[PDB]
Amino acid sequence: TVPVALVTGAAKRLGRSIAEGLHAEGYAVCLHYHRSAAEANALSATLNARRPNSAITVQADLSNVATAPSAPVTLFTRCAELVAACYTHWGRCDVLVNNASSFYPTPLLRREAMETATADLFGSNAIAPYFLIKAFAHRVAGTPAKHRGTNYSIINMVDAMTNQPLLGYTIYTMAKGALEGLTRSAALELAPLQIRVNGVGPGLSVLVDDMPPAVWEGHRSKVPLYQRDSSAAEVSDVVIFLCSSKAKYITGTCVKVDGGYSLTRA
Amino acid sequence: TVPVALVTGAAKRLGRSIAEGLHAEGYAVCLHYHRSAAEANALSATLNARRPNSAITVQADLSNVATAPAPVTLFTRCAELVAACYTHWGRCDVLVNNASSFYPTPLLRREAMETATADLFGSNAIAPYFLIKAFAHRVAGTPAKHRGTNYSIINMVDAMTNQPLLGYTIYTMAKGALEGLTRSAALELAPLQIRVNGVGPGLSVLVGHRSKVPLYQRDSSAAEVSDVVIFLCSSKAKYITGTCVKVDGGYSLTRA
Amino acid sequence: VPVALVTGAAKRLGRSIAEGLHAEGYAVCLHYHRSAAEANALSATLNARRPNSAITVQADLSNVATAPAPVTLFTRCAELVAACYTHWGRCDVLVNNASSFYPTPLLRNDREAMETATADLFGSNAIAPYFLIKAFAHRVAGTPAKHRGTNYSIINMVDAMTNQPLLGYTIYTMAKGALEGLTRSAALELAPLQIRVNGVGPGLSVLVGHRSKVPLYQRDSSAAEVSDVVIFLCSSKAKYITGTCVKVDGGYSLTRA
Amino acid sequence: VPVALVTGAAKRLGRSIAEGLHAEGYAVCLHYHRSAAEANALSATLNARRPNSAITVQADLSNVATAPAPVTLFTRCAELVAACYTHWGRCDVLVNNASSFYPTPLLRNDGDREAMETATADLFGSNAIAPYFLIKAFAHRVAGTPAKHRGTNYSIINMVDAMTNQPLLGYTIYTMAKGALEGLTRSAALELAPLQIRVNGVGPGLSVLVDDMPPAVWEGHRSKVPLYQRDSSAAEVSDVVIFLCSSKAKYITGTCVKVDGGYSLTRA
Ligand SMILES: NC(=O)c1ccc[n+]([C@@H]2O[C@H](COP(=O)([O-])OP(=O)(O)OC[C@H]3O[C@@H](n4cnc5c(N)ncnc54)[C@H](OP(=O)(O)O)[C@@H]3O)[C@@H](O)[C@H]2O)c1
Ligand SMILES: NC(=O)c1ccc[n+]([C@@H]2O[C@H](COP(=O)([O-])OP(=O)(O)OC[C@H]3O[C@@H](n4cnc5c(N)ncnc54)[C@H](OP(=O)(O)O)[C@@H]3O)[C@@H](O)[C@H]2O)c1
C-alpha cells in the first residue's frame, strides 16, 4: 500500500525537497537526474537508510534530441522508460512531478548553440513533461480498474513570474507557457481516469547568488512578503499538499508560491 | 499558543466545514451568522463540548446598510466582529471571508434593486474590506513582541465568475471586487506578515450542470473545499500570498 | 447619425474619447460632475464644427442619494441615457469613463469620510456603470427590432495595472475589479441584443519617476493613444469583439519590481 | 511603402490579413508551405491592383532540417525575412499566422514514431518555434539598420487562440504551442520595446469554421458563440490585426486581443 512518486531533476534544490517531502509522507521515490549522479545517489542512500527500498535513481537527458543506444533513442522512449522504471521496480507510479528544467538566456538581440538551446529548454520544460504524462497515463489506462491506485496526481513546476518576462529568457518563458497549457489540457483529458494535473509556480526560491551581494539582496528585497526568496520547503510543502487526498477536487490549476512577487510592477 | 479564527457565515455548508476544519487543527473559532442563529449555536455547542471555550457566535448583517442601535454603519459592525475575538480570547489570527448572498440581478426582464446592491456587494466585497481593515489595525496596534506568528486571511471567491452565470451581474461583480481586495490587501499587509489569499469553489454541496464537472462529474463536498482553506492557513503555506486557488474539478476548463 | 454617451467627458481621456467619437460622426452627450466650464467649452467646440452634435448633462455618479423625494443613483443614471433619447432619439454607444481615484489605506500609518469614499469610488467606477448599462440595455430592448441601431457598443474604462495593485488604493482597485466583472457579465447577457461590451485599460496616461519605467517609449501615453483604441472598439470593424479587455499600457503590466 | 510579411497567407485568415494590410497600402510578402496555387493567385490579384505590391515565398516552418548541408528552421526563417529586404529593402510588419492544427491524444482509448516525432516538430514549429526565429531575424534586421533609416511603425502580430485556456479535448501539443506563442508575445514585446517594435497577439474563437461534418453538427458548434451565434468571417478577425499594426495602436504592446464573440465566457 506504498504509493510511488517519480520526480524529475530530483538531485537538488526544489526537486530534492519535493522528493524528501513525498518520502516523508510515505512514498517510495524514483529520483531522476541528468548530470547530478553523485548528488542523486547520495539522496537515495539517505532515503533508503531511513526506509529500505524506498528510493531508486534513473538517468536521462530530457532535452528534445535523440541519444545513442541499435538505433537512436528518442526523447519519448527515454520518458516512457522513466515511468517504466517505476512499474518494473515497484509495480506502480501514483505521482509524477515534472520539476527538471534548464534555465538560461536566449536573447533576441545581440548554430549548434541555438539548435541545442531550443531542444534543451523546450525539452526539459515542456516536451519531456508531455511524453512523461502520456506514458504515465498509458500505464494507468492499461491497469485493470480494480488494481488502479486511488490518488493519481501530476504536478508541473511552472513559474509565477513568466507573465512579467525576465529580459532575455524568451525560449524558457515560452516553454513554461507551453507547460501551463499542458497542465490544463492534460487535466481535462485525464479527468476520466481520475488523474489530477496541477501546477506549482515559484517566484524566487533559493535564489542563485552568483553576483555582488548588493545585487542579490536588491533582488530578494523586492518580494513583498518577507523580502526574501523562499526556502525549498516553502515550495515543496505545497507540492506535497496538492498530491494529498485532501486536494482531490483540485485539477487543472496553477498555484503561485511567490510571496506576492507577481503583484509588483516596476 | 491557541490561535483564533473568525469565520463569516459559519453556520452551515462551506463556512461550517471551514470552522470545523480550523477547530480540528486546534483553533478557537468565532462563528459569525446573520439569520442562522439556531444552527450557529448548535455548531458552537458541539465544538465547545469537544474543547471548552473554543467557540463563540456573533450576529451581524454584512449588507452595506445602516442598522438600528445613532445608526450603526457596516464598518462598525465589522470592527465589532473582530473586536469580539480580541475581547473574548485576546487575539484573531485568521479571518475567513465566507459569508455571501447569491441571487439573480437580471439586466433584462428599485427598493429590492437597492437592497440587492447593498446586500450582494456588502457581504461579498465591502464587509470583507472592512473586516480586513479592522483585522489589520488590531495586528498593527499589537506590540511586535506580542503578535502571532501566522496571520492569514482567506477570501472565498468563485472559480467560475470569469464564465459568468447568466443574470447574476452584481454578484459576479462583487466577486471580482473580492479578487481585487485579495491582491491589494496581500500587497499592503505583507509588511505585517499577514497573508491574504482566495479559494474559489466551482460547484459545491449543491442542494443540473453537476455532470459537466470534468473530474468525478459531481459538485464537491464541503470538506473538499474547506481542507484547502485549512492548508492555506497552515504555516506550511507561509510563502503563499495574493493568490486565488480554484477548487473546481476542472469546471473552469470547460466551454459550451 | 449615431449617438455616444461619454461619462466624465470634460477633460483628459474622456474628452479625447468624446472628440474621437465626434470625429467619426457621432453626436455626443458629454457627462460631467464638477467640470461644468470645461464640459460646456468642449460642447461649444464640437457644436461649432457640426451643429447639434453635442450636449452636456451633469450628474454625481457616486452611490448616494441626491436632493431634487431623494433621487437615487439608478434614477440619475437612467436620466443620463434618457437625455440622449429625448434630445436625439437614440443612444448607440456608452463609454463608462468617469472615475474617482484616491487612496484608501488599509494601515493608519473624518469617520464618514470612509462612507463617502466607498460610495464615491465604487459608485463612479462600478455601480453607476452597472446602472447606466442596465438603462442603456432597457432602451434598446424597448425599441422595436426594425428601428434598432446596427452597432451598439459599450466600453468600460478599466485599468491595465490593477492586478499589480497600487499601494494604498484598495477600494479603487476593488472597484475596477468589479468593473471587469461587469464587462464580462454584461457582454454575455446583452449578446442577444447585439450589444457589445468591452474594456480598455490604460497603464499610465497624461500624467500631471514612474514614466521612465514604461518599456515602450519610457513615457505615459497621450490621451489619443488611449482614445483611438476606444474608437476602434466602437467601430463596425470590431463587431465580433465582446467581453474583452484591451490593455493600452506600453508593456507596463509586463514589468516586475 | 511599408512592407508586411504574412506567414500561411494563401487562404482563410492569413489571406484576409494580407488583403487587409495591402488595402492599407502595404506591399506584402505572402509565405506559403503547400498552397502554391492559392498563394500565387493571391499575389497576381494584389499585383494587378498595384504593381510590385506582392511576392510569394515557400517554407516549411516545421521544426526540422530540410534538404539544401541540411537547412535548419532558423535559416529558413531568416531567409523569409531576408526576402523582404532583398526585394523591397524593408520589413515593417510580421504576422505569425501559419499554423498546423490536429489532434495529439494523450490516450489511445483511455509508422508510429514517425507521426509523433513529426507532429511535435510540425505543431510546435509552426505555432511557436518558427515565430520565435522569425521575430529574432526581424529584430536583428531592425537593429542592424542605422536609426536614421528605420521604419517608424514596426509591429509584430502573433495569431494566438482565445479558447486555449478551455482546452479542446485531444489537442494537447497544439494547445501547448499556442501557450508558448503567448509567452513569446510578452517576452519579445518587453525585449524589443527599446527598438519600438511592438508585439501583440490576436486570438480568434471560431472563425470560418471548417464544415466538413454534418450540417446539424456544424450549426450546433457555431450556435454556442454568445454574440450572433456563429463563427466569425475572416475580415472580422483580420480588421483587428490591421488596426493593431496601425499607428493609432502605437502605445499597445505585449497584449493579446480576443476576437471570439464572447465564446471564452461560456462554460459547459
Ligand atoms: N528556483 C527558482 O527561483 C524558481 C523560480 C520559478 C520557477 N522554478 C521552477 O521550479 C523547478 C525547480 O527549480 P530549481 O531551481 O530547483 O531548478 P534547477 O536547480 O535549475 O534545475 C533542476 C534540475 O533540472 C535538471 N535538468 C535541467 N536540464 C535538464 C535536461 N535537459 N534533462 C534532464 N534534466 C535536466 C537538472 O538535473 P541534473 O542536476 O541532475 O543535471 C537540475 O538539477 C523548475 O521547473 C523551475 O523552472 C524555480
Ligand atoms: N456552493 C457553491 O457551489 C459555491 C461556488 C462558488 C463560490 N462559492 C462561495 O463559497 C462561499 C461559501 O459558499 P456557500 O454555498 O456555503 O454559501 P451560502 O450557503 O450561499 O451562504 C453562506 C452564508 O453567508 C451568509 N450571508 C449571506 N448574506 C449575508 C449578509 N447580507 N450578511 C451576513 N451574512 C450573510 C449566510 O448566513 P446565515 O445563514 O447565518 O444568514 C449564509 O449562511 C461563498 O463566499 C460563495 O460565494 C460557493
Ligand SMILES: NC(=O)c1ccc[n+]([C@@H]2O[C@H](COP(=O)([O-])OP(=O)(O)OC[C@H]3O[C@@H](n4cnc5c(N)ncnc54)[C@H](OP(=O)(O)O)[C@@H]3O)[C@@H](O)[C@H]2O)c1
Ligand atoms: N490616467 C491614467 O493614467 C489612467 C490609468 C489607468 C486607468 N485609467 C482610467 O481611464 C479613465 C479616464 O482616466 P482619466 O485620468 O482621464 O480620469 P480622471 O481625470 O481622473 O477623471 C475622469 C472624470 O471622472 C469624473 N468623476 C470622478 N468622480 C465622479 C463622480 N463621483 N461622479 C461623476 N463623475 C465623476 C470627473 O468629472 P468632473 O471633472 O466633471 O467632476 C473626472 O473629470 C478612468 O476610468 C480611469 O480609471 C486612467
Ligand SMILES: NC(=O)c1ccc[n+]([C@@H]2O[C@H](COP(=O)([O-])OP(=O)(O)OC[C@H]3O[C@@H](n4cnc5c(N)ncnc54)[C@H](OP(=O)(O)O)[C@@H]3O)[C@@H](O)[C@H]2O)c1
Ligand atoms: N479558424 C479558427 O477558428 C481559429 C481559431 C483560433 C485560432 N486560430 C488561429 O488563427 C490563425 C489562422 O487560422 P486559420 O484557420 O486561417 O489557419 P489554417 O487555415 O488552419 O492554416 C493557416 C496556414 O498555416 C500554414 N501551415 C500549417 N503548417 C505549416 C507548416 N508546418 N509550415 C509552414 N506553414 C504551415 C498553411 O499553409 P499552406 O496552406 O500554404 O500549406 C495554412 O494555410 C492560426 O494561427 C490559427 O491557429 C484560428
Ligand SMILES: C[C@H](O)[C@H](O)C1=Nc2c(nc(N)[nH]c2=O)NC1
Ligand atoms: C533567477 C530568476 O529570477 C528565478 O529565481 C528563476 N530561477 C530558476 C528557474 N528555473 C530553473 N530551472 N532554475 C532556476 O534557478 N526559473 C526562474
Ligand SMILES: C[C@H](O)[C@H](O)C1=Nc2c(nc(N)[nH]c2=O)NC1
Ligand atoms: C449554483 C452556481 O452554479 C454555483 O454552485 C454557486 N453557488 C453559490 C455561490 N455563492 C453562494 N453564496 N451560494 C451558492 O450556493 N456562488 C456560485
Ligand SMILES: C[C@H](O)[C@H](O)C1=Nc2c(nc(N)[nH]c2=O)NC1
Ligand atoms: C497614477 C497611477 O499610477 C495611474 O496613472 C492611474 N491614474 C488614474 C486612474 N484613475 C483615474 N480616475 N484617474 C487617474 O489619474 N487609475 C490609475
Ligand SMILES: C[C@H](O)[C@H](O)C1=Nc2c(nc(N)[nH]c2=O)NC1
Ligand atoms: C475548430 C476549432 O474549435 C477552432 O475553430 C480552431 N480552428 C483552427 C485553429 N488553428 C488552425 N491553424 N486552423 C484552424 O482551423 N485553432 C482552433
